C-alpha cells in the first residue's frame, strides 16, 4: 500500500526475472546507503581541492580508469578521443563506506565539489565531448550531468532544458553556486523549460553532442521516497506509458543531432523496457519515419576500463548498465552511446 512497497514488489517480480541469482545482491544495495563521488569543481581551485580529497583517502576514479585505457591489452582510440575530458571525481575504495563532507564555497566563492552518484558521471564521460562542441542536455534538471558537461570546458554552447520550471530553478541554483557569473550569464549557456519531444522541430540537425537522461521509474529513489512516488496508484497510467515518452525524447534528441553527431541515452532504472527497448524503439522510429540511420556505438572497452570502480551487468544487448553492489553502491545507471549516420 505504501508506493515504496508497490515499487519493491514490482522490482522483485521483474528484476528477479531479469537478473536471476544476481538480483539479491542488487536488491540489498538498492535498500542500503548509496555510495557517492565528489566531482571537483574545475572553476574552483581544482588542484587544491583534489589534494584535500586525496588526503581523505579517496581517489579520482576517472584518472585511475583513464590511466588504464591502453592497458587491457585493444582500445578503439586514445582515451582523449573517446571520453569527455577534464573530469575529476573522487570516490573511496571499494568496500569503504565513508562519506565526503558537504561541499562549501572556496576562495572564488563557488562550491569546491559536487556530491553525486559516481555512476551518473559515466554517460557524460561516454558522450565524448571535444573542444568546440555544441551540446544539448535535453532533460537537464536538477543539473548534475549539466554541471559535468560544463566542467569539461568543451561546450562552445550548452543548451540545458527541462520541462519542469521548478526543477529548472534547482538547476539555476546549482549553476549559480558552481559556475562563475561569466560562463552562466554569457552566450555559452541557454536554459529553457520546453517539452524535449519537440526538439526536432525546434533545432533539427543542430547539436554535436546530445545527452538524453530521461524521466524513468528512478528505481532507487522510488524505494526510499514515498512522496510523489511514480508507483502511487494516482500515477499508474503515467508510469506505464513511460517507455513511450522515453522513446519520443530519445528520438527528438537524435533529430536535434547533426548528421555524424553523437547521442547518449541514459536512465537510472534497471528495467530493460526503459533501457534497451527504448534505444531500439527510437532507432526504429527514426529509420521508419524519417529515413535516418542511427548506429549504436560499442562501449565495451569503456566498460572494461571502469570495472575497477563499478559493477556492470555485462549481458546488455545494446548499451551498458551499472548495477548496485555493496562493494560499490552506485547506480542503477543505464547508458547507450549512438551516432546519427544520416
Amino acid at each position: 500500500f505504501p508506493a515504496v512497497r508497490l515499487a519493491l514488489q514490482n522490482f522483485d517480480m521483474t528484476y528477479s526475472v531479469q537478473f536471476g541469482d544476481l538480483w539479491p545482491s542488487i536488491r540489498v544495495s538498492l535498500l542500503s546507503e548509496q555510495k557517492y563521488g565528489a566531482l571537483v569543481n574545475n572553476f574552483a581551485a581544482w588542484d587544491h581541492v583534489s589534494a584535500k580529497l586525496e588526503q581523505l583517502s579517496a581517489k579520482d576514479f576517472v584518472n585511475e580508469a583513464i590511466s588504464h585505457w591502453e592497458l587491457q591489452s585493444a582500445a578503439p582510440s586514445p582515451a582523449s578521443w573517446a571520453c569527455s575530458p577534464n573530469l575529476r571525481c573522487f570516490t573511496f575504495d571499494r568496500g569503504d563506506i565513508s562519506r565526503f563532507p558537504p561541499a562549501r564555497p572556496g576562495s572564488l566563492g563557488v562550491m569546491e565539489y559536487y556530491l553525486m552518484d559516481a555512476a551518473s558521471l559515466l554517460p557524460v564521460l561516454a558522450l565524448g565531448l571535444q573542444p568546440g562542441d555544441i551540446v544539448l542536455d535535453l532533460c537537464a534538471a536538477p543539473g548534475g550531468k549539466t554541471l559535468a558537461l560544463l566542467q569539461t570546458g568543451c561546450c562552445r554552447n550548452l543548451a540545458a532544458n527541462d520541462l519542469s520550471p521548478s526543477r529548472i530553478a534547482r538547476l539555476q541554483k546549482i549553476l549559480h553556486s558552481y559556475v562563475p557569473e561569466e560562463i552562466r550569464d554569457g552566450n555559452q549557456v541557454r536554459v529553457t523549460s520546453w517539452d524535449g519531444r519537440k526538439w526536432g522541430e525546434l533545432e533539427g540537425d543542430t547539436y554535436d553532442r546530445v545527452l538524453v537522461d530521461v524521466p524513468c521509474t528512478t528505481d532507487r529513489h522510488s524505494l526510499h521516497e514515498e512522496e510523489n512516488n511514480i508507483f502511487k496508484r494516482s500515477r499508474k497510467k503515467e508510469r506505464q506509458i513511460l517507455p513511450v515518452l522515453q522513446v519520443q525524447l530519445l528520438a527528438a534528441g537524435l533529430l536535434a543531432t547533426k548528421p555524424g553527431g553523437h547521442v547518449v541515452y541514459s536512465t537510472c532504472s534497471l528495467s530493460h523496457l526503459q533501457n534497451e527497448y527504448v534505444v531500439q524503439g527510437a532507432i526504429e522510429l527514426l529509420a521508419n519515419q524519417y529515413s535516418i540511420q542511427v548506429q549504436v556505438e560499442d562501449l565495451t572497452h569503456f566498460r572494461r576500463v571502469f570495472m575497477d570502480t563499478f559493477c556492470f551487468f555485462s549481458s546488455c544487448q545494446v548499451g551498458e548498465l551499472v548495477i548496485p553492489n555493496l562493494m560499490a553502491n552506485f547506480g542503477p545507471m543505464y547508458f547507450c552511446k549512438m551516432r546519427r549516420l544520416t
Binding site: 563506506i97 555493496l326 562493494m327
Partner: protein, 233 residues
C-alpha cells in the same frame, strides 16, 4: 581420612585417580559433589566443571544447597543443567536476584511457560549475563519483527545469540529478499530458511548456503547496518 572420602567418591563415579589427585592439587571437597550428584548426571562432566572454575570448592554449602534447591525449583532438576555449568559457572556464584529477574522477565513480560522458561534457561545460559530489557527487546525482535512465535523461539535456541548477530543476519536476509516476515497466520510466499541455518551455523556457512553472497559483501553490510543503527539511535 581418605577412606571416609574415597569410599563415597569411588563408589560414586571417579574414573581414574585423576581428578581426585587434581582435587588434592587444587570437608567442602565432598559436600559439594553431593549437591552436584543430586543435581544429577555429570559423572565425567562433574570433573570437567570442577576443572573449569574450581570456585565451587570455595562455595559455602549452606549457600550452595540453597542454590541447588533453587535451580531444581526452576526445573534444572533432574540435572543437566549440563551445558549450563559448562559455559555459565557463574550461575552458582552470582546474585540470586539476577536469576529471578530473568525469570520474572521471560515469564509475564514476554510470557512463555514455566517449561519454556526452564528450557531457555538450560539452553541459553547467556541470558543471565545479558542486560534485561535488552533481553526484552531481543524477544520483541524475534516475535514482532521476525514473526517467530514462542515455541520456535525456544526450540531454536534464539535467545542465546547476541542481538547484533540476529539483526545482522536477519536484516541481510530481508534486504536480499531471502527472508519474509510471516503475514497473518504465519504465511510467507516462500518458506524462509530454518532458524538454525540463519543463527546457529558459522558465518561462512550462512553466507555460502543461506544468504548466498560473498563474505566481503556481508562485511560491508555490517558496517552499513551499524551506521544506520547509530544514526537513528
Amino acid at each position: 581420612x581418605x577412606x571416609x572420602x574415597x569410599x563415597x567418591x569411588x563408589x560414586x563415579x571417579x574414573x581414574x585417580x585423576x581428578x581426585x589427585x587434581x582435587x588434592x592439587x587444587x570437608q567442602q571437597l565432598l559436600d559439594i559433589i553431593s549437591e552436584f550428584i543430586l543435581l544429577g548426571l555429570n559423572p565425567e562432566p562433574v570433573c570437567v566443571v570442577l576443572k573449569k572454575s574450581p570456585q565451587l570448592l570455595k562455595l559455602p554449602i549452606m549457600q550452595m544447597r540453597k542454590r541447588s534447591s533453587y535451580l531444581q525449583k526452576l526445573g534444572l532438576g533432574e540435572g543437566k543443567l549440563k551445558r549450563v555449568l559448562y559455559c555459565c559457572p557463574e550461575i552458582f556464584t552470582m546474585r540470586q536476584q539476577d536469576i529471578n529477574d530473568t525469570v520474572r522477565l521471560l515469564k509475564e513480560k514476554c510470557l512463555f511457560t514455566v517449561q519454556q522458561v526452564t528450557k531457555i534457561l538450560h539452553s541459553c545460559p547467556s541470558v543471565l549475563r545479558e542486560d534485561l530489557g535488552q533481553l526484552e527487546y531481543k524477544f520483541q525482535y524475534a516475535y514482532f519483527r521476525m514473526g517467530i512465535k514462542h515455541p520456535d523461539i525456544v526450540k531454536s535456541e534464539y535467545l542465546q545469540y547476541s542481538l547484533t548477530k540476529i539483526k545482522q543476519r536477519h536484516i541481510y536476509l530481508e534486504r536480499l529478499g531471502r527472508y519474509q516476515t510471516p503475514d497473518k497466520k504465519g504465511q510467507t510466499q516462500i518458506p524462509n530458511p530454518l532458524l538454525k541455518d540463519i543463527l546457529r551455523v558459522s558465518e561462512a556457512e550462512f553466507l555460502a548456503r543461506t544468504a548466498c553472497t560473498s563474505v566481503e559483501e556481508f562485511q560491508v553490510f555490517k558496517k552499513l547496518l551499524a551506521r544506520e543503527e547509530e544514526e537513528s539511535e
